């Protein structure tokens, strides 16, 4: 049984913790629930850590007093199809292999499934670790509670004796690097300096061997990613997000200075040997838009190349951990601002961006966002009970599973079938434009080998490559974003029409140049 | 927001509660969750209650940390 | 009403039948249930047949005493979509037409449906008889009991006056030959010599006119294909299977000599004029793995060509009736062993194999097979009754329809939804690799005309054709096999990655050769 | 066996932390957890039938007991 420790003794040194803990809703929650610090207290000084105390990062540290939120969080939505490859005719991007050729995502890119699996899915996907990690057997794929208990309770490593990234099966890639883990777990929150900079007090950084890092990590989406464990108040911990909102001064709502002020973030920094080490961002309000934007954003988390001179940008560069914090129509400018692109297309040779799940930046400016609606209203609403203490569902999933609480409470004029029909009208129309965009991109891509082989000039091929950048961006945003246009249908429509226009321009340019060569 | 009380000071006069509380699974659960004893502590001796402390009997006193058991009960 | 005949009188001549009938569970079942032999008894000698007795092959001969098994067998699973073409974006092989071009399957290849329809579906598919046979009208497609009663009760022949194979509609083929029928019916069991060799006592053989043969056949999957009618004991009758297991000495489990010994087969031969004529294989145990492997295997049942010299191998050759009895990683060696391939690709000119539903050979070595599980455990389990005499379901279908009896009885840790999720994780991942394999095959195939037209050398085109063989085999195994990887997911994954690797090698070879030609 | 085994059993979850139901009620609402876990030989309908056999027989004897008490009282 737990025995409480004297917190006043800790507070003698830990004034920041004291200021947070004594004021918030965890003022009665003793440190022993999450820390074992006996030898630490015996050996620390006011500025030196001494022996390092143990800190629990497991979600069961909170499940003892908050069982309802924990049990809701770990639920597995079996209807969210698992390991479902997006590059197929029946999924999101039928022509993805042709369009993304040259990028690691061509090796495998599945649809998202329930949050319990994020860290295990990161470890086992074919594009990440060369196939090094696998579930212990094919039955473990169902075990959400198990993954939450710890990745290494349900996974195996093909070679515990080596720590290099390499292929264990032929059609894999080794795209994983330490920055990825920041959107899968925060078990390393005390072992990682802000932004993943080299730091004397950090065990891990952007330049670590990712296989060694991986082995030290266990839990998905820790409860404390959105809730400060000391004050119980709302916060974010993701360094890339804090850097965009605070360091770069862009605000929580870059298009709306007023809302940014009302719903802002305060950066709090913690030190090691009196030098800045790690930071959190305390939120003015429990604003899920900003909490979910710790991960559901377009980012860089990988090496790439400079737009200016084509030279390599490695994990050591700050650009390898970056939130663009820009909507699709500001993205090209945001990438120029850091002089960066992701890959060269295997067939066209064009410099291209790689886009990732930009839900937060898409939602900006939408009718719902402008009316003060936030991700949690549709994806993790209050539970409705005939008799009971209300709590917030923590099973983040499509609103189709709880339409009464997620939509119909605000849309009293609709039945459930009418609301579903409205969602499907947008998704159907948007998907049709994604498919047309891919058709035009593919038609352009197919013309590059023909044009090269017919002796079309580099100048013309380079003009087509510049068009490919825009055709790609204005399409890939929407296969990356998970709502199939629902979060911002007018924006999806305008962007996808732009993609098509750019591809058509490129097709015309290449067809005319090929025809002229043949005529000579 | 609740502010914890000095449980050790209570135990100077409440050895019977001490022997139960310090040993079981509520050893970390501060008295302020269920008792309002400020004026009691100001006025008591080990041999004189002084002002009577307040004790919560409402089931919500338990529902803060045990919402699942409470919600299942009230169905 | 039936009147019993004196069996002792038959046994005077039929000592093999006597030894089987008097010992097994049909010792009380009189011959008159299946044979009308009055004129036979009057005219036969100990070595000459005399007048030929009538033998019932209809399944209703068994339905009289085994109504539950019969009624279960003839059920139609309406959820198994009928006449569903595999070469479409929403079915198993979106790029099948490009990949299989040159083979008869391009004319039509539908997904399997319930067993009642096997013989009628064989007769009416567009690739089989030039469109000669059709259901009497489009309503008869529902009539499972009717098909069982007899193919010719529900079908029409466009020209009863001719017996040649020819096209009656433009987009048909005439791929059917007498060997096919062995996996659709055994109505010809007394009229077909072992392997379909020419034989004085056989009316039909590999070289028969298939249209004439077709007209003599009526019933699908006769009950006696798995059950000896004389002993009621377990058996197989399929000559190709007996030839692999017994004549070639490969055993019932080629990867496991011990299991092969415990679960073996004894070949029993029947003679005509004291020369060997037909054979059956009695099983040591009621082992459904071997019973279902009478048909659910990769086979040759068609003419083809020799790998060595390209020369024609016709129906007259023993190779036209052949069970490879090899897993996907031993198949290329098994085809070299008989010096055989199926067709030349219409676009690439490569010699290619054609693979067919290799469920039995895929299942070998899987976790379930290694633990003693067999096809019937998942596809035709015991019926569970609150009060009743238990019998075995004979409706062979996906376990999704009886998850309590087919999975959850062994997997007590799972709910039905969790078990379904585990199956779908494998099928989704496997299908994504099938789709990627087809993408790479198609990219290679498309380069052949470009390379030929650019003047790439025969030596390079032949190197690419040798790669095409392997790229094709390691892909087509999985579109042919019906479990979408479930029967052996690690094997499907390794094979599909091999297919992709081979295609990528071929693409690189061809792109480089085309580029070099253009540079000259 | 104790009252809680039939009237406030542990919750069964595909994924989650087990806790004890505190909704004290008839086992007919949670037969999987209140009976069928110990009585593997039964379906839910069979277990309900066994309950109703006892209650039907008992209630019949209650009614007959009241008939005779009423006849005496009168
Ligand atoms: C002064 C003598 C201290 C007392 C008493 C306690 N701690 Fe401490 N702690 C101290 C220092 C100088 C540091 C390094 C960081 C800094 O502020 O300069 C720490 C660090 C921690 C940590 C972080 C450990 C890590 O892995 O990074 C934790 C969780 C921690 N301390 C907890 C803690 C608790 C619970 C105490 C009372 C039981 C406590 N500390 C006493 C200095 C001192
Ligand atoms: C019991 C010993 C607790 C442990 C361990 C944790 N929490 Fe807690 N939490 C506790 C209480 C008594 C309260 C206040 C209840 C009330 O409403 O008065 C809380 C409150 C929270 C809140 C709400 C905060 C707010 O609204 O301002 C959150 C978000 C919260 N707690 C989260 C949390 C997490 C993430 C934990 C694991 C690190 C955790 N709590 C542990 C009791 C206990
Ligand atoms: C980084 C730590 C994340 C935060 C914070 C949130 N999400 Fe998330 N989400 C994340 C990943 C890595 C995944 C895929 C997990 C996998 O194993 O595939 C997801 C998935 C979702 C989904 C899909 C769930 C399904 O049933 O398929 C939804 C609806 C979702 N995420 C929403 C969501 C919301 C609303 C958030 C703020 C409350 C949120 N997520 C935070 C990574 C992270
Ligand atoms: C936060 C900015 C993220 C970083 C950095 C990484 N990922 Fe991620 N991931 C993120 C979200 C919000 C989701 C769910 C939404 C979606 O569109 O998928 C994911 C999902 C995954 C998955 C599951 C889906 C799939 O693509 O197969 C995998 C396997 C995954 N992520 C791996 C991954 C790797 C290898 C990363 C570094 C290169 C990486 N992620 C970074 C959020 C974030
Ligand atoms: C961000 C992606 C979150 C993670 C991870 C966790 N929770 Fe949460 N929590 C979140 C939101 C948006 C809210 C609602 C705030 C509002 O006022 O609208 C909550 C709320 C809580 C509470 C308060 C009581 C309630 O409303 O349910 C508690 C006790 C709480 N959350 C606990 C909790 C635990 C234990 C988690 C890990 C399993 C957890 N939260 C993760 C957002 C996020
Ligand atoms: C209601 C007005 C919504 C708000 C606010 C947010 N989202 Fe959403 N989302 C919404 C719908 C109707 C859909 C389509 C769901 C369907 O079943 O068709 C989505 C989709 C998602 C997804 C994918 C979910 C899935 O299909 O499994 C994700 C990952 C998601 N949304 C995330 C998300 C985030 C992070 C938000 C705040 C920035 C957000 N959504 C707002 C409805 C609503
Ligand atoms: C949070 C501040 C709490 C309040 C208020 C109450 N309890 Fe509690 N309880 C709490 C914790 C952290 C634990 C230990 C969890 C663990 O598993 O270690 C408990 C435990 C219980 C138990 C189980 C005890 C045992 O098995 O020996 C019971 C029956 C229990 N608590 C009941 C209970 C009641 C009736 C309360 C209101 C008077 C109550 N608790 C308040 C945290 C908190
Ligand atoms: C009634 C006159 C029968 C006809 C016609 C057929 N069978 Fe039969 N069968 C019959 C009996 C009385 C028994 C034994 C029942 C018992 O369990 O004691 C059987 C048994 C079978 C078995 C089980 C054999 C074994 O377990 O060893 C099979 C597989 C079987 N019968 C099949 C069968 C088939 C395929 C028939 C048509 C050719 C057929 N039977 C006819 C009674 C009668
Ligand atoms: C040759 C005589 C066969 C034997 C012996 C078995 N099967 Fe079969 N199967 C066969 C054919 C020709 C077909 C397709 C029939 C059609 O008209 O399309 C099938 C089909 C199946 C299916 C699919 C059923 C559905 O609902 O779609 C299954 C699940 C199946 N077969 C399984 C099966 C099992 C388990 C067997 C041994 C008990 C078995 N089959 C024997 C040909 C033959
Ligand atoms: C046993 C080794 C077989 C031989 C020889 C033939 N077929 Fe077949 N067929 C077989 C099985 C086990 C199945 C079901 C599984 C599947 O993948 O389809 C089938 C199915 C058919 C079907 C229905 C499906 C379709 O392809 O449209 C048809 C029309 C069919 N078979 C025709 C056919 C012809 C014309 C054959 C000789 C060239 C032939 N089959 C041989 C098993 C076996
Ligand atoms: C192989 C593809 C089969 C065909 C065709 C038929 N049956 Fe069958 N039968 C099969 C198996 C694998 C079993 C179970 C053997 C075991 O012990 O596990 C059976 C069983 C029977 C029985 C025995 C009683 C029972 O278990 O149901 C009978 C009477 C029987 N089968 C009859 C039967 C009839 C009448 C069929 C044609 C409609 C028939 N079987 C086809 C495999 C195969
Ligand atoms: C359980 C461990 C199984 C054993 C043993 C066998 N098969 Fe199977 N099969 C299994 C699953 C879970 C599936 C996918 C079904 C789904 O609905 O997703 C299959 C599929 C088939 C099919 C196609 C069925 C259909 O989808 O209609 C066939 C023709 C099939 N399997 C045949 C088969 C044979 C002949 C086996 C013994 C060699 C065999 N299966 C074993 C589960 C299991
Ligand atoms: C399972 C072996 C049981 C144990 C142990 C206990 N009870 Fe029970 N109880 C049981 C049944 C099958 C029924 C009839 C319910 C029905 O729907 O027909 C009952 C009934 C009750 C009732 C009335 C419940 C109602 O009908 O709403 C009460 C108040 C009740 N039982 C209390 C009770 C107590 C206090 C027990 C321990 C001493 C106890 N039961 C044990 C099954 C079982
Ligand atoms: C007697 C009639 C009870 C009342 C009133 C309350 N609870 Fe209870 N509780 C009861 C039993 C029989 C059990 C299980 C004991 C066992 O080990 O089998 C429980 C358990 C708890 C626990 C432990 C965690 C769990 O098993 O769920 C907690 C935290 C708990 N109970 C809390 C609780 C609260 C908050 C109540 C008032 C709403 C409450 N209990 C009433 C018996 C009784
Ligand atoms: O690939 N370096 O960890
Ligand atoms: O791949 N995760 O964005
Ligand atoms: O095509 N010969 O039957
Ligand atoms: O086409 N039947 O394998
Ligand atoms: Ca999903
Ligand atoms: Ca990006
Ligand atoms: Ca089917
Ligand atoms: Ca073949």
Swiss-Prot record, chains A, C:
Cited function: Catalyzes the reduction of nitrite to ammonia, consuming six electrons in the process. Has very low activity toward hydroxylamine. Has even lower activity toward sulfite. Sulfite reductase activity is maximal at neutral pH.
Organism encoding this protein: Thioalkalivibrio nitratireducens (strain DSM 14787 / UNIQEM 213 / ALEN2)
GO annotation (BP), single: anaerobic electron transport chain
Keyword Oxidoreductase: yes
UniProt-annotated binding residues for heme 3: 26, 62, 65-66
Top-level enzyme category: oxidoreductase
Catalysis performed (reactions): 6 Fe(III)-[cytochrome c] + NH4(+) + 2 H2O = 6 Fe(II)-[cytochrome c] + nitrite + 8 H(+)
Activity's thermal dependence: Optimum temperature is 80 degrees Celsius.
Binding site for Ca(2+): 298-299, 354, 356
Binding residue positions for heme 2: 31, 34-35, 230
Binding locations of heme 4: 223, 226-227, 394
Protein name in the entry: Cytochrome c-552
UniProt modification remark: The thioether cross-link between Tyr-299 and Cys-301 may play a structural role in the active site cavity. Besides, it may lower the pKa of the Tyr hydroxyl group. An additional covalent bond between Tyr-299 and Gln-356 has been observed in some protein crystals, but this may be an artifact that is due to the formation of tyrosyl radicals when the protein is exposed to oxygen.
Subunit structure: Homohexamer. Dimer of trimers.
Cofactor: Ca(2+); heme
Example of a GO cellular component annotation carried by this entry: outer membrane-bounded periplasmic space
């Amino acid at each position: 049984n737990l025995k409480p420790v004297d917190a006043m003794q800790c507070f003698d040194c830990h004034t920041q913790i004291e200021d947070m803990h004594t004021v918030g809703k965890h003022a009665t929650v003793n440190c022993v629930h999450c820390h074992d610090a006996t030898e630490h207290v015996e050996t620390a000084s006011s500025r030196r850590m001494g022996e390092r105390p143990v800190t629990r990062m497991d979600l069961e540290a909170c499940a003892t007093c908050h069982t309802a939120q924990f049990n809701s969080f770990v639920e597995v939505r079996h209807e969210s199809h698992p390991r479902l490859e997006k590059a197929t005719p029946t999924s999101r991007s039928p022509m993805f292999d042709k369009l993304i050729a040259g990028h690691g995502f061509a090796f495998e890119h599945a649809e998202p499934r329930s949050h319990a699996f994020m860290l295990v899915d990161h470890f086992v996907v074919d594009r990440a670790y060369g196939g090094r990690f696998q579930f212990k057997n094919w039955q473990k794929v169902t075990d959400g509670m198990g993954a939450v208990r710890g990745a290494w309770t349900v996974l195996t490593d093909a070679d515990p004796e080596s720590s290099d990234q390499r292929r264990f099966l032929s059609q894999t890639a080794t795209a994983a690097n330490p920055v990825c883990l920041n959107c899968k777990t925060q078990d390393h929150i005390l072992d990682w300096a802000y932004m993943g900079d080299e730091h004397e007090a950090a065990k891990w950084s952007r330049t670590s061997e990712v296989v060694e890092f991986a082995r030290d990590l266990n839990h998905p989406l820790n409860c404390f990613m959105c809730h400060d464990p000391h004050s119980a108040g709302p916060r974010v911990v993701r360094d890339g997000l804090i850097n965009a909102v605070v360091d770069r001064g862009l605000g929580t709502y870059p298009h709306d200075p007023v809302k940014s002020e009302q719903q802002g973030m305060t950066k709090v920094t913690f030190q090691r040997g009196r030098e800045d080490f790690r930071a959190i961002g305390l939120l003015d309000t429990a604003d899920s838009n900003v909490m979910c934007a710790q991960c559901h954003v377009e980012y860089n988390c990988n090496p790439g190349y400079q737009l200016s001179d084509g030279s390599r940008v490695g994990m050591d560069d700050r650009r390898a951990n970056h939130f663009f914090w820009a909507n699709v129509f500001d993205y090209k400018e945001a990438a120029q601002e850091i002089d960066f692109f992701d890959f060269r297309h295997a067939t066209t040779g064009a410099a291209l961006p790689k886009l990732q799940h930009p839900e937060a930046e898409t939602f900006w400016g939408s009718v719902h966002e402008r009316n003060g609606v936030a991700c949690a209203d549709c994806h993790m609403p209050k539970v409705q009970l005939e008799n009971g203490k209300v709590y917030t569902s923590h099973s983040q999933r499509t609103p189709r599973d709880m339409m009464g609480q997620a939509c119909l409470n605000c849309h009293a004029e609709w039945t459930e079938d009418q609301a579903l029909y409205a969602i499907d009208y947008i998704k159907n129309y948007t998907h049709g434009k994604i498919v047309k965009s891919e058709y035009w991109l593919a038609k352009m891509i197919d013309l590059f080998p023909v044009a090269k082989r017919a002796g079309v000039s580099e100048d013309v091929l380079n003009q087509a490559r510049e068009l490919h950048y825009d055709a790609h961006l204005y399409w890939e945003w929407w296969t990356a974003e998970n709502s199939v246009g629902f979060h911002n249908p007018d924006q999806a429509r305008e962007s996808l029409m732009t993609s098509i226009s750019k591809s058509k321009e490129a097709v015309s340019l290449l067809n005319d140049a090929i025809d002229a060569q043949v005529a000579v």
